Every structure is written in C-alpha cells, then in structure tokens.
C-alpha cells in the first residue's frame, strides 16, 4: 500500500599503488590534518579534528580552496591492522533532482607483495524517498573525486618520504 | 594615523585556442547554462540565470556536483563585438588566512589568423584589511581554475561543432 523505500548505490574502484599500505593508510587516516593540503594544494585548505581523538565517532572537517565551502567527515571505522577507514558525509550532498541520506566513502589497502597495496575504494549513496534517478557522471564523480584524494597523498608521499 | 587600505591582486594568464573567438565566447557567454554541465560534467551541475536578460546586472548561478556547494556570478561587463567578459564573486571568497572582499574574473579572446584565438585570462582579488598575506598555491588555483573552464568549455565545442 505505502511502503518504505531506500536506494543503497555501491559503485567500486581499485587500483595498484607503489607505496605500502601502511604508510599510504598513516598519510591520511593520521596525518591527514597536515598532509592533504600539502597533497591537494589548490583544492584542500585546511584539513581539521572538530570533535573526537581520530577514533570512530570523530568528526573531522575539510576546508576547500576558493568559493567551494567545506564539509565534515564523520569517522565511523578505523582499522589500522588492516588498513581500512570508512567515514560518512550527511550535508551538502543533495542532487538537483535527487536527496541523499548520506554519502559512505570506504578505503581497504591490501599489501601486494613488493609492496605497495592494491587500492580498493567504494562510495554508497543512500537515497531518500519514493523515487530514485542517479546518473552516471555524478556517481562516478564522488568514487573518482576519492580514489583522487588517495592519489594525491600517494604521489606527495613518494616524492617526500621524509616527514 | 589611521589609514584605508585595499590590495588588489592580479594574476593573468593565456593560451592559444584553436576554437575561434567567436564560438569560444558565444559558448561559455551566451549558451553557457547549458554547455558548463556538459563541458564539465564531473563538477558543473547546474548553470542558470536568476536575474536579468544575460547582460551587464545579471546573476547566474553555478551548482557545483557533490559537496561543492554553489556560488553566483555577477555580471559587469559584456562585449560580443570584443568577445570580453567579466564577472564578480562576492561570497564564499575567504582564506582562513586573508578575507576579500570580491573576485573579479575578466576574460578577452583576441582571434589570430588561422582562428582560433588568443585567451587572454585575468583574475584580480580585492582585500579587506590593514593586513595582506595571500600564497601562491591559492592565487595560482583561481586563475588556474577560470582558464580551465575556459578550456573545457574549448575542447568541448571541438568535439560537439554541432548544437
Ligand atoms: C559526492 C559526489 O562527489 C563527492 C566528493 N566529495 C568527497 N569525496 C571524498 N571524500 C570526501 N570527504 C568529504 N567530501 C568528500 C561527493
Ligand atoms: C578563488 C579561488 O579559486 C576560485 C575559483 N572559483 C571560480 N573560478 C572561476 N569562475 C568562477 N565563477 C564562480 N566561482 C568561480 C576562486
Ligand atoms: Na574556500
Ligand atoms: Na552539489
């Protein structure tokens, strides 16, 4: 008669890094705050802890470079073991034509041998309401602005295994 | 004793088009509401008018995709003949370091036999303060920016001489 309904769109990459996952995973899960700026220079301002220790339930909160605004990152699993993070964005994060309840963004790094890592990152997109139309650029942007993000760490830190 | 003060800042930048003036400007001006999403598909969402006919006055509005946020173009200067144009940003324009007070985007398409053109870009960010400390990084990342939705817009005509 009335149903409840929720989309739950997964969209998945990967890719080889040369860096190990354990520092690949320490670049940005613990020293995000001052390395994504030093990574991304023209689009990450500032990369700051608002709430909480870097633990689940921390909320974190980038400041973009130019008329682009911010967002916070909610921390929801940090797994240093085996390299994974996932964390959620609850703002800002409406289509023209479709809400969304949230966006999760999740990093798993698997240590090829000779190191590095294989890369695998996933996004979901939580739909709210009756309806659903999601098109291909805009769910490729979110995987791709990510599996970016984690590039651009990847590439400051080969080229500056000092710090 | 007690002075105004006010920096402006300039940045310029150009390149060769092989589009021709004309066409160049006559996509980002006039159709620009519907080729910017087209042109930029991974970061342009929406690009509408919401006051005025096009000319000097008017206020467009781009919505950025994902959790970019949305800014408004207002419009100063419009020249077909010259194919010049020029626009202000207004809000959303801090540093964490620097407030401004606007950013005026200014471009002229000077063609050169053969077509296209040269594109002749330029950025000038005004402050507020008695104080001025503005990097490279962010200077860089505004013009870099504009010439590169000017670029997008280029090759996108290029590829699609119909519409
Ligand atoms: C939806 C479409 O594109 C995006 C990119 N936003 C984004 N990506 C990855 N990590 C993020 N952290 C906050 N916002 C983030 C979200
Ligand atoms: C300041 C630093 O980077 C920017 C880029 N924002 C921007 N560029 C070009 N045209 C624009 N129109 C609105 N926002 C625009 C502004
Ligand atoms: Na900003
Ligand atoms: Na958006």
Same mark, same amino acid.
């Given at each position: 008669?009335?149903?409840?309904?929720? %989309?739950?769109?997964?969209?998945?990459? !990967?890719?080889?890094?040369?860096?190990? =996952?354990?520092?690949?995973?320490? %670049?940005?899960?613990?020293?995000?705050?001052?390395?994504?700026?030093? =990574?991304?220079?023209?689009?990450?301002?500032?990369? !700051?802890?608002?709430?909480?220790?870097?633990?689940?339930?921390?909320?974190?909160?980038? $400041? *973009?470079?130019?008329? *682009?605004?911010? $967002?916070?990152?909610?921390?929801?699993?940090?797994?240093? !073991?085996?390299? =994974?993070?996932?964390?959620?964005? &609850?703002?800002?994060?409406?289509?023209?034509?479709?809400?969304?309840?949230?966006?999760?963004?999740?990093?798993?790094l698997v240590p090829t041998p000779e190191e590095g890592?294989?890369?695998?990152?996933? $996004?979901?997109?939580?739909?709210?309401?009756?309806?659903?139309?999601?098109?291909?650029? &805009?769910? !490729?942007?979110?995987?791709?602005? *990510?599996?970016?993000? $984690?590039?651009?760490?990847?590439?400051?830190?080969? =080229?500056?295994?000092?710090?």
């Open positions: 008669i009335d149903p409840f309904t929720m %989309g739950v769109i997964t969209s998945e990459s !990967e890719y080889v890094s040369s860096l190990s =996952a354990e520092k690949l995973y320490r %670049g940005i899960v613990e020293d995000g705050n001052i390395i994504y700026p030093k =990574a991304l220079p023209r689009f990450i301002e500032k990369a !700051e802890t608002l709430e909480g220790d870097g633990g689940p339930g921390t909320i974190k909160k980038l $400041t *973009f470079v130019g008329d *682009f605004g911010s $967002t916070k990152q909610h921390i929801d699993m940090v797994d240093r !073991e085996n390299c =994974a993070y996932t964390y959620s964005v &609850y703002e800002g994060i409406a289509l023209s034509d479709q809400p969304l309840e949230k966006i999760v963004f999740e990093f798993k890592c294989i890369v695998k990152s996933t $996004t979901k997109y939580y739909t709210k309401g009756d309806d659903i139309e999601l098109s291909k650029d &805009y769910l !490729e942007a979110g995987i791709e602005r *990510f599996e970016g993000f $984690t590039k651009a760490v990847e590439s400051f830190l080969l =080229a500056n295994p000092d710090y």
